[PDB]
Symmetry: D2
Subunit: 481 residues, 4 copies
């Protein structure tokens, strides 16, 4: 077995080590060819056809790039080829746990079908990785290339999900702590996964990317920080880092949280909910599973991809009809109609226990305008979106270590006031989108009245089209003026 070269539109010609090749050429990895990166985003951005497979390749590639650069500019770190391979494998495999339409599955479907469980694509990734290793006899191949499976498999899993349960990792000691900052950076969110999806998503969406990850890699070092060895960025690049998160936020505003893309995610999820009792995926031994239970058997999960959509679509079985028509309403583009967007004011925050109580509030909303058709709770959809810099209310740049030209291994910290005052004052907010599931002209009018009224009463922000869509309501007392 020899090295393979693969041509990627984003990174160009990528070299894949034979071990990476044997990991890639498995049913568990090839599965990612049938899972769309941005899910329902494709039904809004027609270029967004790319899948988790190529993304995974890109993440592995960039992980290798960064670890290799660090290794070559600072030999005293003793980064081994074994380290490089493990970091590449973690990069390659940290998307293994995604389900149909990616985030829709873990962010929308599973929380509704099985509110029981705490499931994330990360855990799915460790489980699926274990399953890949075991089902494909990769351990002797790992050994063949100088890896020690019991130490290194642990290292990889820890890279993907963090500590498997004050140095909490058992795959690598603290003098190699920086190796844990590459694939999934739990301390500030700056990792190679973001870099690849910036470049790739922008390539396919038709939006252009302004973050230069190659530059970051060029300016990256390893420093001592509180007796740990961590990745330090050159000081003057701090601005770029802010821009990075700005970029992330922008991509969420323009594409990932697109109103119609989101309502399509919602409709698809709902169809999955109405199909969850009649669609079956056969797992280990021959035992049978459903969409919501596929996550409990990795052999079953292996056969759970975007294909389920088409299965629901092409079915003839009557028991699936409630599902099958929903998808068809997507095909005819008869979608739930968008009513508007608003935000909480002051210190008010929307808790996740109170979401189901939100359409019903809107349905209750006070009249004021002459009434026609009247809509109920089930006719309204309320979607709450949390926009942040990846670390709740916190500024992630406060958790970045920097170095100076004068003393390149002396780590320093940089506060927001040392960079710019045009920077954000907050790093978290919520957006509330309201849609109406009945689509005729005056049901839409009514829904608009209900919505604007509801915004006024909870003292939310004034809807941008407020003066137009509800001229009789927005005049009501005037701190919307």
């Amino acid at each position: 077995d020899t090295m393979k070269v693969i041509n990627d539109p984003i990174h160009g010609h990528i070299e894949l080590h034979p071990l990476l090749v044997r990991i890639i050429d498995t049913p568990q990895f090839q599965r990612l060819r049938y899972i769309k990166q941005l899910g329902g985003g494709y039904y809004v951005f027609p270029g967004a056809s790319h899948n988790r497979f190529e993304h995974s390749l890109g993440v592995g590639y960039l992980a290798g790039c960064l670890v290799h650069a660090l290794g070559e500019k600072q030999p005293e770190l003793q980064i081994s080829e074994r380290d490089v391979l493990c970091v590449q494998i973690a990069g390659l495999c940290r998307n293994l746990g995604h389900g149909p339409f990616s985030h829709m599955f873990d962010g929308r479907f599973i929380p509704l079908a099985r509110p029981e469980v705490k499931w994330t694509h990360e855990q799915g990734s460790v489980m699926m990785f274990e399953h890949l290793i075991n089902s494909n006899g990769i351990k002797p191949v790992m050994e063949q290339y100088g890896l020690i499976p019991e130490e290194d498999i642990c290292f990889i899993k820890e890279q993907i999900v963090g500590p498997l349960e004050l140095w909490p990792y058992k795959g690598r000691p603290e003098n190699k702590s920086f190796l844990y900052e590459i694939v999934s950076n739990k301390r500030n969110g700056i990792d190679v996964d973001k870099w690849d999806y910036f470049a790739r998503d922008c390539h396919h969406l038709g939006i252009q990317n302004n973050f230069d990850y190659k530059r970051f890699i060029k300016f990256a070092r390893v420093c001592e920080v509180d007796n740990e060895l961590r990745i330090c960025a050159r000081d003057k690049e701090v601005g770029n880092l802010y821009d990075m998160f700005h970029t992330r936020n922008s991509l969420h505003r323009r594409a990932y949280q697109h109103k119609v893309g989101n309502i399509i995610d919602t409709m698809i999820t709902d169809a999955f909910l109405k199909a969850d009792d009649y669609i079956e995926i056969t797992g280990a031994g021959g035992k049978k599973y459903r969409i919501s239970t596929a996550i409990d058997d990795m052999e079953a999960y292996t056969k759970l991809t975007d294909n389920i959509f088409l299965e629901i679509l092409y079915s003839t079985d009557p028991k699936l009809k409630d599902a099958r028509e929903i998808l068809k309403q997507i095909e005819y583009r008869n979608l739930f109609k968008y009513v508007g967007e608003t935000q909480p004011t002051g210190q008010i925050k929307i808790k996740r226990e109170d979401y189901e109580s939100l359409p019903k509030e809107v349905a209750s909303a006070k009249p004021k305008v002459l009434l026609d058709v009247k809509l109920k709770a089930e006719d309204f959809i309320v979607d709450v979106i949390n926009m942040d810099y990846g670390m709740q209310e916190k500024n992630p740049i406060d958790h970045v270590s920097f170095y100076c030209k004068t003393a390149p291994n002396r780590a320093i910290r940089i506060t927001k006031n040392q960079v710019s005052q045009l920077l954000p004052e907050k790093f978290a907010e919520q957006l509330i989108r309201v849609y109406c599931k009945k689509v005729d002209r005056k049901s839409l009018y009514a829904a608009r009245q209900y919505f604007v009224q509801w915004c006024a009463d909870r003292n939310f922000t004034k809807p941008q089209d407020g003066d137009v869509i509800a001229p009789l309501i927005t005049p009501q007392k005037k701190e919307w003026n």
Copy 2:
């Protein structure tokens, strides 16, 4: 209703007329989201995830661009909004008839599964267009926006497939002959479909395009040629046109006819053949169909996409195991192994009646070298590829009309010697690829001996790696070295 804007990575923001939108928002059109543009090419070029849907949008857009530009520079052509709409619709819909993995279906599967019948993706497109119109009540929508359904549907179909069988067209008179040169150009192959897949395939493959379609549009005029009004290119642009076809040829050499991509198309095709008796697709009124017979009922064809692959992959049914097994060997990357490439010499040409006659020919030849293994007809695959400039042995530029700066309304002709002596001397050739279905080291050695000997016996060209893979055979051949 009103205009829609769509963001395409290739063309930017595209405006879609409400009628185009109503055509697009049908299951017949949306079907194309599930058919890969380059089919098995995706399994070699990981960026090639794009589907026929986005390509179709692009072709429709470019058709609109060209017809509009011609109309705007030459008002005396009297191009109507109606004409523009018909050309856009034809552009949008000329890909409707493609089947699973695109060219794999009409180029490989159907010819083996249904050798009696005459099937093309063009005819499929016409049929599917008819079915779309009728199933979705598009005629009244057409009338609503100023179209005359009985002439215009004819016009559109003729744009897609040509004269339905003097002036052979019934959709438009001869003074608008140029309108038939835009979407599918039967006269020289220069059309907007090519331009779009040049740009899009290059965007996704990671290979770059050197053809400037925008420049061509800028320099395009309509002039009179043989009592018709046809599209003429500015004289000095003739070089670009040659480059265009060179580009096409190049794209086939690098990507579309990639050895491994083709072998994967072949394996998928074989799997489809071995699954064709057990896979059922529900058509009109409930009648059931097979993969090879789905093309006879458009309601069934509507649900025949790339999905069929995954069905075969995910099945449990024992009657499908021989099919399913082939697919799984694709997942494990256990592919038929490439033995070599060669070409006929002189005037010898291989017709499709002789294709089935080729493995038996390769196995019968025997080289003066001691072997080990002996191979049969079934162990060989022989793939014949016709590389040309789109008009077989002809020079397509001999079928292009040009105009000069001094007299922009006078069409002229340009010969190859008036352009360059560095141009191709022939415009068609055939490539012969040979693969072996046994993958062990020694079946492979044997297969290489059989292959090089066979090349010698038919006086084909010397395989490029000839001296290395068969050192005992290549000197005994003096029409080489």
Copy 3:
């Protein structure tokens, strides 16, 4: 005379009207081929070789694009071909007044060599436009193409510089008010000039921006506001607009205000000043002019370009050597050394009256570290840069008119709290860079001590490398520690 087609790397093939062609082919316009867009920026970003010529072509092109799009979507605006031509000419010619190395000249040189006069590149553009027209007989050509010279020339000049003297314009009436918002938008700064230099500068710098001007153009309308017809943007596009200005700020941080690029602009300016008594430039009747006084005669200004640099570089006369030597220290890369950066912390701002008093203060700070050299003001350079959103402390988006999907003809306003809470709270700030003109190790050490001490004494922000370059000074103030 016919349309000319020109190939630009940014916009592709652009069509130039014969009148535009006649304006371009004059020494006054062709002059711009010899003035670099980013000046000394080229000495930091080696790709930034582009000149004001190609930029001007781009601005003219985009001006035409916007006016034409508006005219075609809203025929009721009565936009004439004459209007389109005047807007194109204004776009083409608003950069005519730039001097050697662009913004270095009017922003740094003229304020120092001739502090008496109020000079801008805008006024220079009006003057040079007049000179182009009169010196090249363009008025009869204008009439030849349906323009009315004395109203339209007025219109063009007003587009470039604003009102020449309530409706303040005499070139066009209020029902054509929107035409004044295209080439140079004095009301919120959103114009096609920005759009071209974003794309072009990014193309050459090798840094990239995410602003889509084509999308904006697609969503642009004309609405009635107070008493005029002004350009309206679609409501939901407001986010993009914020991003636009963010982009601009980013572009200033990364490239236009690069510490070294700025110090090189400073050195070139000083050389020009020390040369400002011996270089002589031929004027109107033979009268002779010099670099600072060339702006008083357009015939002389026509011959004032970047060339002056090389002339000073290649000269032999001793009265020029203090100049010629400065330039050579640029060639040997013996530049003034960068000492550090800081900012004010309250609401009082370093006024432009206090700049000359800033180096002396740096000399005034007493650092209690033992030094070996001590420096006075001449060895320090203090550069103060105003970073804003183009409208002082104000939010330019507060000056943008929007429209809604439901009522495209009703202009509305959108406030910051209505978009996001992650936006900037102020829209203006200042950067303070300090350099040292003596470059040996000990003057640099000393200068850093002086600088950090000066930061301490004035309660400015902590230099990012503060603890590293001056560890003995920095503990003195508990809020850095």
Copy 4:
């Protein structure tokens, strides 16, 4: 001191070794900022503003990339950091010898001003390199970083011009022969200089590049052929190589030999000739030199750039008026008029001794058209352009060594017949362009009659617009029809 990072739009962030930096920061190298890569090309393609400086940086970068890659895939070659540095330096410096407007200077001006001499930009590069070394005291710097000035300077010069005169090189032994194939490949022309100008010129022209140099680097090896060590390409990449030269030819057709670009080069050259008596350039020790004699003293040549153009343009000395007005006729776009293009037929070729007799041949021709204006020899320009694949009549791919995957280290040859039948049959041809120095309508008409008649008389190819520009002449010739 230390490494610098520089951001290039083509290659991204490039690392510069301190020695390279000290070579770059000299007047001899910085000189290249003022010499346009494509000369008069900028006056046709407005994006083509880039200079020889950034191109040189790109060539050094790619030279480094290739030598590094070879060193890392095959350690047994014993490539040292010293080798890498010497190759990078040669890459950086092989453009030092270009004069004003690049190829205009050595291709047009010098051959006319001094037909005597054997001058090339290569020899200029060696002389200027010597002058840089000596004038800037870089030898102790070379020694400081482990280079041996006598052998290494020899090596670099040999890389630029070839053997300074068995094994003809004395800079490096035969086991390092492959190192001579990187910067200037005298054996087949495949070198990094080409790769960089493909990418950069395409970036700036608005033409897109279709050669993948990174791919080539990935598939490049060193093999033994004729007891020498040469760079080998992977066999299956041979098609790409043909495409490479095709690309080159294409770039010459579209941009480098553009009719108007070439005529502008011609006019600038004539201006240089008529100025050749009055501009004075001070050389070594106050000795003074001419534009045509600057090449004999490197101190003078150092101060000979594109600036010369502007000097002539801005001059007031009456003795320069003949030059000065010519340049002005460029500014007003009053150019020599393009009459037409033709080529020799059969195997007859035009020698350079016969170039001077060709306008007289055109003026002597008698066309049977009624004329009143008739033109003489001095009114015609005949430009003969040699288009080839870089090796005169030879196929350069016949001089490329290949390897097969089965024996990656055994060199082989591949003939044209083993690749395609669609390839060029000849690899050299000539283009003959005719221009007229009188630009009026009737002189242009006359010039066209003379030209087509001259083509008929020499049995050249029929001009593409022949039937249009000279309808009374072209029927006379029945090898035209």
